[PDB]
């Protein structure tokens, strides 16, 4: 309490008490204080099928993960035995698409990164509360079978799904093509109060293995690619996907060097 | 400064400096409880020639006002009397156009309006502070000659043209027709602190002779009537919709009245 | 009988019965003559539902006179009255569509124009015959019940419709709009001769309540409205014939002022 | 002037110029009459190098007539001769081009037609003037040499084109191709009056050998073939259609000629 | 035997075969040598309805040879009979389509020719052998009963169509237009030799009745028409055919002067 | 010469001597044998900075061999260590552009291409002329220092570019892409005459390292890329599809080698 401080603050809050137009009482000026305190600290600080697979061409499949609900990371493994029955054999090339995903249930999508990676760092919050400090670890199994995988992400690529391909982008797993992220990570908890009333405020933030803030940094591709035409000069959705057909392309290319 | 709510306000400051990720002090989470009060309580609270005129058919002239300078009321009255005199006559129907027209002296949008009451009141401001309530009234004398007219508003026509609208509308002397006003009927004081700084606040508001308030409410026009533009298949009615509009309505209005 | 004159003329009917290619008799030679003088004078001189009503929208209803027949008359005042059943009140405004009308039965015009008129002149023949001169004035029941009314007239209106227009005008009962008039009013009588034939000649002209003759001045509207396209710049027939949607107009902001 | 059908004429003049709205005197009447009886009976009574010359192909050639002046007549027998020395022996075929033409010298007319007349008429009028009566027979040399030509008429071709065309078709010497012709075939003399004034009057007009009349039945072609433009996938049958017509059936008839 | 041109030729071939990449024996060479040999001399030398008929306007009827096979002289005569039995009467005018024609049976062609010839020669083989000379002459019978007749020929018109046109247009029976011929006159006959194998040889070529070589001049129509569009300024085939339109306007014509 | 077979073939000529159809000497026909024997044989047979590089991306470099001239292979060389300079460390990628190349010095593409390999083949020749036999293998010296590289190949790259791109593949130390290339993998050496003529033959042909015949088969690249323009909703990759193909293949391919 630093009582000067609060003197100045006081001091203006009756000032508009006098002045302002309609009347205001004492409680509607502090809520408002308050209430604005907040929206400039921080933003977010105040007072249905989950998962597509197909195999586009023989040996190359192709994952969708529209949203992470609970059930996501077990439809996302049995979509992945799907396609290797599908292929009738291991699988040449895989793409992860999670473009256009806003996020969800964190557990799920640390679960869905657990299905590629068996060991190393997934993500790790960090914040100065006890309890926020919290690292998740990949477990040895991975029913991905070590396929060569590209994921996409978008401009709408947010929360989970930065988590995710940020996790496989710095334990070097997967290829991330497509346009920059969203770049928001942040886990806002809601604090109680003495008054009949809670606060919500972003306590810490989300950091993959590597230690870059996906708040700040975002999740960068390692192939930058924007939407685009090709003009040859000589179901199947790459046809009419870009960045689909520029990731397939990829994968081939791999197979056929590797 | 009731005490007993401060604990709430302060405990409540307290919580948020110990739990948002990076540390702030407390100075900057006062000076945002500052600019917060005063950006919850209120969006404006902080811490040429003017007229032109043409007869646009026998009988028939419009008045454009650009904008409300000191010399606005004079100009306004020379261009009545001499459109009285371009007709040879007194005039079968005029036109006011307020639209594209911020606002400006209010004295002169006294003298503008008061070029067309005889009595009554024009405008009164409602506020809390000592000095703020002014009212104006018309005076006895309308250079118009009581001619028919009508005013047109869009969007654009805030502050003093809305409270010559206004008055125009209440007092049953024109017709008003086009689209919504602005709506910006308020005033701003800066009032100044014991600390070496100052804070822009709302002191009292405008009210047309009615009493509706121009800040909430607007000036809606008697007739809705888009923007729109006309193509035969100088002359200004000839290419703007809303003026022509106005103009075969005093046309019509003129022909019934006989 | 000039004598004279009529050697000049005679001299040139020998010379041109003297010279001409192919024979000609003097009796041919006499008709040409009377042809041509009569067409040299006056270019008229020689020797099925009629009405169609609707309430286009609430309060606002619209009357076309297709043409002037002997039912006409009692078709437009049922009309009137059925218009005020369909609107379930009194009416709001009318459009009365003479344009396109070519003319028809002198009487059912009168009748018509007796459906908005209560006392007054309706329409006078002016000639230099005994039995020409003639004046039609109002009764005093008018089916309309004061109903404000716009007539529309085109080029192409012509003759009863003419007579209707310019005497709803000059009794400044209705809004004339549109285009001029096609500018005809005459009444050809055919007179006897000796001769077994007899010869058509304009004997009148018809002339409307204020004293214009129709046949040079026309109708003139008193707001000129040629076709157009609007373009917003933010059954119902109205919404693709340009001139009904301004009538419509003009009624609602006539029936919003008054 | 038989008086008794002369009391018909003015008892009719006399209704008139009493039933008439507007007053008129008897020496307007009179003049109308006149100049009706002048109207009524006939539409005309009232009250540059000549010639180019091409050889379009081997043993083809094309020989245009713009206009009919003095010079015509020598003109074209020049390029006759001219053409067969361009052609360095007989021709195969010719193409008159009376087209666009509407006339001009009467004399030059028969000599363009001596050019290619050995024998027989050429053209004859017919009147009841005195000396109006004039007959123009062809002359036995003919610088044409009996080459087969297609002259080519259009409808703006009028007077000595047609005389020419109807000699040339009438006697069986060429073959008619194009459009329908004007028929003016009409001849106007002024006649001097007892009066300071005159008439014109057409005296007589003209017949082709057949007998045919030209002011009525013009001169129909023997094969009609309307205006057209030919675009391939200088050279004038490339780019004219009635030209190229008229060339390809002159090189038929030469080939099946032989 | 010049020997001494044979060692140049056994030296080179000696050359070749010691300096190759891949070895090569005396016989392979030898057949090189002869194969290039032949090559060098002569490019052909080396080591289903046939007929559609149409009566197209009255009078006016076309003919097409798809292809000269052994039925087709019957079939146009056929044709012919059938073609004077649909016009119920004898025919005005006659089209012969040999356009897009490659060749077919001599005497097929010969006895097509024969369908219009009644005197005189159509095709004469010129060589150097004794069997080569060969001469073909029309018999007295004719189906055509003198009909005139346009042929139409394209580039794509060879062999027998070339022959038949070039014989209907030596004997100036027929009309030629259209673009000019294929120009290829040829007989490969196949000569055995000693070996176990045979040459085909080009051995003697056609000649028309005139005595031009149909193989280099080829055939030259008397009237030239491309492919064009006509634009007028004012089943049936022609209307989208530009030559047969052509060739039947031309017919037409010949008609009427005839 | 065996003149059993000479038998045989003074046979067949003279036979064809007797029976074309114009007469030809011997000495044309032997000639024609010679020229056709070689043709017959071999289609060959008868009777500007070089390179220029860039670095495309941070580790990623782009190297172009527009032609092979004698400087080629210095060029190329301080082009390598220029773009490690430029990168400022080891590369990542880089490409080798050898699309649009004809070929050049021999010793130039070897030169090349030893700047890629530290061991094994790189070319020889096959031939049965005494001193054809060159075999090229690589020096224990690359300053490529084992990037990985791709190498493009189009349709317009032979002979030297060919060659250097076959030994790149089949050492299996780049990847090749593009289309298919030209196959002109021959040398023609001039052969002198005992007449005063001589004969180009094809005395020996190219093969990779494989064993593969680059006349015949080609360099068929591991990945199949048509050319194609990219257009964004220098860097050359954003415009060249191929170039950036290959670019995204060595970035992942750098990203999975991690």
């Known amino acids: 309490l630093p009582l000067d401080e609060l003197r100045t603050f006081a001091e203006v809050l009756d000032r508009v008490k006098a002045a302002y137009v309609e009347p205001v009482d004492d409680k509607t000026l502090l809520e408002n204080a308050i209430k604005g305190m907040l929206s400039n600290l921080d933003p977010h600080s105040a007072y249905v099928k989950s998962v597509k697979s197909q195999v586009l061409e ?34 040449k090339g895989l793409v992860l698409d999670l473009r256009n995903n806003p996020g969800g249930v964190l557990q799920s ?27 998740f670890s990949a477990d040895p199994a991975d029913p991905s079978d070590k396929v060569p995988l590209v994921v996409l992400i978008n401009g709408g690529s947010a929360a989970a799904a930065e988590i995710v391909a940020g ?19 942040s886990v806002q908890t809601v604090l109680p109060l003495n008054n009949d009333r809670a606060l919500k405020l972003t306590t810490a933030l989300y950091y993959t293995p590597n230690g870059r803030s996906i708040q700040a940094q975002g999740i960068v591709p390692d192939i930058e690619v924007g939407r685009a035409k090709v003009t040859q000069e000589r179901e199947r959705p790459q046809d009419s996907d870009y960045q689909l057909s520029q990731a397939l392309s990829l994968l081939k290319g791999l197979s056929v060097t590797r």
Chains 1, 3, 5 share one sequence.
């Open 58 to 91: 023989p040996g190359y499949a192709y994952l969708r993960i529209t949203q992470f609900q609970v059930n996501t990371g077990e439809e996302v493994v049995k979509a992945l035995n799907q396609l290797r029955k599908d292929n009738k054999g291991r699988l």
């Open 109 to 135: 999508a640390v679960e869905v990164a657990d299905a590629f990676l068996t060991k190393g760092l997934i993500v790790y919050t960090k914040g100065r509360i006890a309890n926020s400090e919290l690292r």
């Open 167 to 185: 996790a496989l982008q710095d334990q070097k797993r997967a290829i991330l093509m497509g346009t920059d992220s969203f770049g928001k990570g």
